[PDB]
Amino acid sequence: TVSLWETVQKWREYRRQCQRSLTEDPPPATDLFCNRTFDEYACWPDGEPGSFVNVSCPWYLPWASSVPQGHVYRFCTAEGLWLQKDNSSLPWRDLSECEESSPEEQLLFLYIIYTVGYALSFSALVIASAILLGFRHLHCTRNYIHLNLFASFILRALSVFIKDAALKWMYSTAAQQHQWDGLLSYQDSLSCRLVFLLMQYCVAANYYWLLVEGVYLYTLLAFSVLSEQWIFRLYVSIGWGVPLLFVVPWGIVKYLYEDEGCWTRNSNMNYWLIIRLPILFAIGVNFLIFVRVICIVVSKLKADIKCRLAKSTLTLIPLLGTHEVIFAGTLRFIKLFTELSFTSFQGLMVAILYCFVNNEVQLEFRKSWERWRLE
Amino acid sequence: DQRNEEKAQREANKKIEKQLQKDKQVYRATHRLLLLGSGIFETKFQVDKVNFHMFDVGAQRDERRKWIQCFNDVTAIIFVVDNRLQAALKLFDSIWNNKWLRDTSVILFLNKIEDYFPEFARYTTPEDATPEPGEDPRVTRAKYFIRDEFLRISTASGDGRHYCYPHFTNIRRVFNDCRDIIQRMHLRQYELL
Amino acid sequence: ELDQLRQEAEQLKNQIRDARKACADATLSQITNNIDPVGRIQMRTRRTLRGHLAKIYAMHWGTDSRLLVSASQDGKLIIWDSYTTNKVHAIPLRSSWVMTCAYAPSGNYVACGGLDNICSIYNLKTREGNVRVSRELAGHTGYLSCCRFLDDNQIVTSSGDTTCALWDIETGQQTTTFTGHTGDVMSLSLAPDTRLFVSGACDASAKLWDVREGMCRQTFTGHESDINAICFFPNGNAFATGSDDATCRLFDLRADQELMTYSHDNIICGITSVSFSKSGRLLLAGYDDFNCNVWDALKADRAGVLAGHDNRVSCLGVTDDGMAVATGSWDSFLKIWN
Amino acid sequence: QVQLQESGGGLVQPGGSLRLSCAASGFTFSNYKMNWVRQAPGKGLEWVSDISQSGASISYTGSVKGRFTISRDNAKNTLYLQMNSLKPEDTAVYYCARCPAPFTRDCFDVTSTTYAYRGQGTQVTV
Amino acid sequence: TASIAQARKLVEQLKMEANIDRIKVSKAAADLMAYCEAHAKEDPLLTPVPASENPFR
Ligand SMILES: Cc1cc(-n2nc3c(c2-n2ccn(-c4ccc5c(cnn5C)c4F)c2=O)[C@H](C)N(C(=O)c2cc4cc([C@H]5CCOC(C)(C)C5)ccc4n2[C@@]2(c4noc(=O)[nH]4)C[C@@H]2C)CC3)cc(C)c1F
Ligand SMILES: CC(C)CCC[C@@H](C)[C@H]1CC[C@H]2[C@@H]3CC=C4C[C@@H](O)CC[C@]4(C)[C@H]3CC[C@]12C
Ligand SMILES: CC(C)CCC[C@@H](C)[C@H]1CC[C@H]2[C@@H]3CC=C4C[C@@H](O)CC[C@]4(C)[C@H]3CC[C@]12C
Ligand SMILES: CC(C)CCC[C@@H](C)[C@H]1CC[C@H]2[C@@H]3CC=C4C[C@@H](O)CC[C@]4(C)[C@H]3CC[C@]12C
Ligand SMILES: CC(C)CCC[C@@H](C)[C@H]1CC[C@H]2[C@@H]3CC=C4C[C@@H](O)CC[C@]4(C)[C@H]3CC[C@]12C
Ligand SMILES: CC(C)CCC[C@@H](C)[C@H]1CC[C@H]2[C@@H]3CC=C4C[C@@H](O)CC[C@]4(C)[C@H]3CC[C@]12C
Ligand SMILES: CC(C)(C)Nc1cnc2cc(Cl)c(Cl)cc2n1
């Protein structure tokens, strides 16, 4: 329903509304009145002596939807001041009317699922990168693109891990307190927006490196022998640079036209497309390349077939991100679980299929074991 | 001192790398072919903007087992068949089962009976392929028997590492077979075959 | 007169076998059993020479143990500086299928050859410009398999026409021809004194030749398959050979027969290159099993293994001072071992 | 020294039988594939039949299929070629040839340039 | 004919090499022993040199 992030944002608008209301509230006559102030919970206007001050409960509360009709009360003494009960502590306030959903609590199973998937993918991809950079017999354009895709997947996993750890730490620091001043400082700082932009760039780079791998396979199959050094640099630029051609413009547009909520709230649906359209285009081109490669494999086998074609399809699906074409408000439950579960394990599947079970890497491993036997 | 000559040697090495990289560009795009059926002839022909550089040996001694080891990295070996047919069949068998030619596909071209091959009496025309228009059924049966006698050798211990592409007599067919071989090799690198 | 002539030839072969056996009362292994073995000899790839585009089939070390030349089927004759890995020359070849390369003892010249039947010799002095094709040695009807410079003036080349030839570089004409071999001659090695050389052919026979007389004085038939490599022992009185029968054999120019055999049960692959060390105690042999085995020339046991190459090892050369060993292979890389 | 000593031959009536045996020496018989080739007058050498290292693979030309059978005895280093139903055209100098390298399946021993690992041949007249 | 001419030439050549002098195998093996033992101490391959003077580090 509503998280602590959205609750805190709504707290910002509630504070702004309270300040505006208190500034626009006409000054009272009979100056023996309390001083209007905000107690970080609800808007309190001038207090009439010897009377309770009643206002509606805050709408930013996560549980406000369950009991919107509740009210919060604060008593004013006959002297014209709030009931402090002492010179040091806060004045008395009756807020028991509303006490009793967050996404991080009602989706624990899926959270653990894709956290484990991303950790396993990170470990497998680090091991695969170490293997491919250590054997030195595997150094080739195909393996260079594989290493770049592995690095992109590693960056995506790191973006997920840093996000989860930051949210966990910030929620732990936000436990049983509601002043959130550090949260004001961080959300009003440019560092949060820079981290968000970096994570979006990492996701876009992973998608476009899947695209680059698909394009490289298509060129190896459908096109003649090209210039290796130039095409490798072109693929590197497409994987790493082309994402900057839409993620950076998306961030610039969001800063210039929204500038609020650390780019979290779309609120337009147009600024979401200016970064999603490249991703959807990459997914579509990957699906087309996948179909073309499957057609080529079918032609090769037709020149019994079901098992080989099925194995080829299951090997090629993780490499090109084919599940994204079927992944791309009403029963978003199952779709969200399927998308996250396949995305988290996509890196692990790619690493396994192209390092651990690849016959060239396995042959290199047997060669190294033979060398060790000779030692 | 040592630094000046070291820098000069490094600059010479850098120029050597610069030349070798362009020569690698032109080498990889060129598909080497071996023709069998100076001491070697070279015929350059181009189809669809890719260059095929076929080799035909000239003054060479008939013991080919040694010098043919240089052609283990060619794109394909072109086999031309002109009884001479049995000798050509055994030559193709030797090429197919060669230790260093197991990774090289063979492009087969077939040309020009019953008493030399007793199994021709029981042979039947295959149904998976159709004859050219105007061909007599007996001629089709004979030519397909000749093709299948090579193919049965090709399907023995093939292991999918290399394939035979028979043809009846072209340059366009050579280009198509080379493209098919390259595609199969690339798919095998991706473990899709 | 063919049948009785064949019988006479067989009878003299039997007589030569009897004469050789009259000297084989004690084998090399029996007399060398008392040797303390060298043991497990470690060797590491100090430098990996990269830059070749196709497989590497031939290599030759320089007399200064600094410059080495390598030949590749891509059409290159690259000269390598071993200490710094920086290439000095990258000679283009008019024939792609080069199968041999030789480096002059003074270093002023370099040679190559292959299926073209021309043994092209390229000058390295370069008085005016860059490297140039100084002389082309045509006349063979086989394929240039091996060549080694006696000096800047004369060279000995082997070919697939079952004959070896001595060439005068200045005139470009053959000085003498060695027509005794009946199979494809694959490798030749010059003696340290350059007075004699021995060549192995595809007839499983090794013949010793004299460069001055052009006449075959000795023949060795101890192998069971075609000889692919041959190299003199550093004393000049013996030579080891390598053949596809997965056995290395050592022959002596005085005993006129095989001294010892270097074979193993698990080795079922042919030998492509053989070379002795500075002392001659270590026999390094290239093998078709992606690896190189270091053999003790006296104990006849594997003292070490050079398994660093990922393809067939085709050429193998030891420095004249024995400092290091460069190993060439079809993986387009050269590895320096010491 | 590798040497092949073929035995048996001479004159045989058409349709009869004749057994060819060659004494192999100078190499390990069991590890090399060996085959028979013949050179009829007026024509070059032609391969006849081959047998694998252990005898698992056997093949013949169509001109001698069924009529000719090949066999090897690794015990005493001998190769055999039994001939049945000898046609008049079967007359030729029968040569036994050896695979140049052990454990290899290919053969290049039909060469007319005096292949080294091939016997002197025994004349067979039908 | 050429067939008998080549055989005659080979037979004459193998006549000539039959009468060459021969040396006992054991003494030749001892000679290789002496050469190897004398040159063992200066062989960088049998006895690896320290990295301080090895040009290939
Ligand atoms: C369990 C679970 C939860 C979700 N889910 N649904 C939502 C949210 C999450 N969510 C994401 C992380 N957690 C979370 C919270 C507490 C936790 C843990 C683990 N331990 N603890 C105590 C934890 F994992 C969380 O609840 C957030 C609160 N939201 C946002 O609009 C939101 C906040 C936000 C913050 C940063 C950066 C900018 C730079 O600085 C930073 C501090 C790093 C923030 C970057 C992107 C962000 N968006 C977006 C988003 N993202 O996902 C989405 O669907 N829209 C759309 C924009 C790209 C409402 C919907 C989804 C799945 C599939 C799931 F299984
Ligand atoms: C935990 C995170 C930060 C690790 C990041 C790993 C990535 C970004 C880095 C680390 C090592 C890098 C590799 C080092 C060497 C090469 C050779 C180059 O010719 C192709 C790219 C490639 C393969 C690099 C790709 C990017 C790379 C894989
Ligand atoms: C996402 C954050 C952490 C920044 C990390 C971006 C990294 C992964 C990207 C951006 C710049 C990229 C480098 C740019 C230049 C090259 C040349 C290329 O031939 C080899 C890889 C290499 C070295 C790239 C490796 C990957 C790279 C380092
Ligand atoms: C996150 C940031 C750092 C990514 C930066 C984009 C990088 C990876 C890409 C985008 C454009 C690419 C450059 C495009 C052109 C060339 C010419 C080439 O001969 C040298 C490399 C060089 C200079 C490329 C290096 C890598 C490059 C800079
Ligand atoms: C979207 C992904 C995850 C699902 C798998 C894609 C499937 C539905 C598509 C992609 C490529 C397609 C194949 C492409 C080629 C042919 C040739 C046609 O004459 C028979 C069916 C066959 C073999 C298609 C079957 C369906 C196919 C395999
Ligand atoms: C969603 C991803 C991860 C898995 C997709 C599974 C399905 C859609 C894929 C995987 C294997 C594919 C099958 C592989 C083999 C053939 C042979 C083809 O001639 C008919 C279709 C058929 C039967 C394919 C149908 C689609 C298929 C079943
Ligand atoms: C399990 C594994 C992928 C190794 N092998 C096969 C083979 N044949 C198959 C046929 C069908 Cl129809 C399906 Cl669904 C899966 C199949 N898996």
Author numbering:
A (entry chain R): 29 to 128, 135 to 337, 344 to 368, 377 to 423
B (entry chain A): 11 to 47, 205 to 249, 264 to 293, 308 to 364, 371 to 394
C (entry chain B): 3 to 340
D (entry chain N): 1 to 126
E (entry chain G): 6 to 62
Question: Could you give the paper's own sentences about this structure?
Answer:
As one of the most well-known class B1 G-protein-coupled receptors (GPCRs), the glucagon-like peptide-1 receptor (GLP-1R) is a clinically validated drug target for type 2 diabetes and obesity. Here we report high-resolution cryo-electron microscopy (cryo-EM) structures of human GLP-1R–Gs in complex with compound 2 alone, with both compound 2 and endogenous peptidic agonist GLP-1, or with compound 2 and a small molecule agonist (LY3502970). Collectively, our structures reveal an ago-PAM mechanism for GLP-1R, in which the rearrangement of the conserved polar network is trigged by TM6 movement and stabilized by the ECD-TMD interaction.
After sorting by constitutive 2D and 3D classifications, 3D consensus density maps were reconstructed with global resolutions of 2.5 Å (without ECD) or 3.3 Å (with ECD) for compound 2 alone, 2.5 Å for compound 2 plus GLP-1, and 2.9 Å for compound 2 plus LY3502970, respectively. The high-resolution cryo-EM maps of the compound 2–GLP-1–GLP-1R–Gs and compound 2–LY3502970–GLP-1R–Gs complexes provide a good opportunity to further investigate compound 2-associated positive allosterism. The binding poses of compound 2 in these two structures are nearly identical to that of compound 2 alone except for a slightly different orientation. As seen in the compound 2–GLP-1R–Gs complex, two cholesterol molecules were also found in the identical position of the compound 2–GLP-1–GLP-1R–Gs and compound 2–LY3502970–GLP-1R–Gs complexes, implying a common role for the two cholesterol molecules. Meanwhile, Gs moved upward by 0.5–0.8 Å, especially the αN-helix in Gαs and Gβ subunits. Such an alteration may strengthen G protein coupling by introducing several newly formed polar interactions such as two salt bridges (R1762.46b and E4088.49b, E4238.64b and R46 in Gβ). In addition, residues N338 to T343 in the intracellular loop 3 (ICL3) of the compound 2–GLP-1–GLP-1R–Gs and compound 2–LY3502970–GLP-1R–Gs complexes, F369 to R376 in the extracellular loop 3 (ECL3) of the compound 2–GLP-1R–Gs and compound 2–LY3502970–GLP-1R–Gs complexes, and P56 to F61 in the ECD of the compound 2–GLP-1R–Gs complex were also poorly resolved and thus omitted from the corresponding final model.
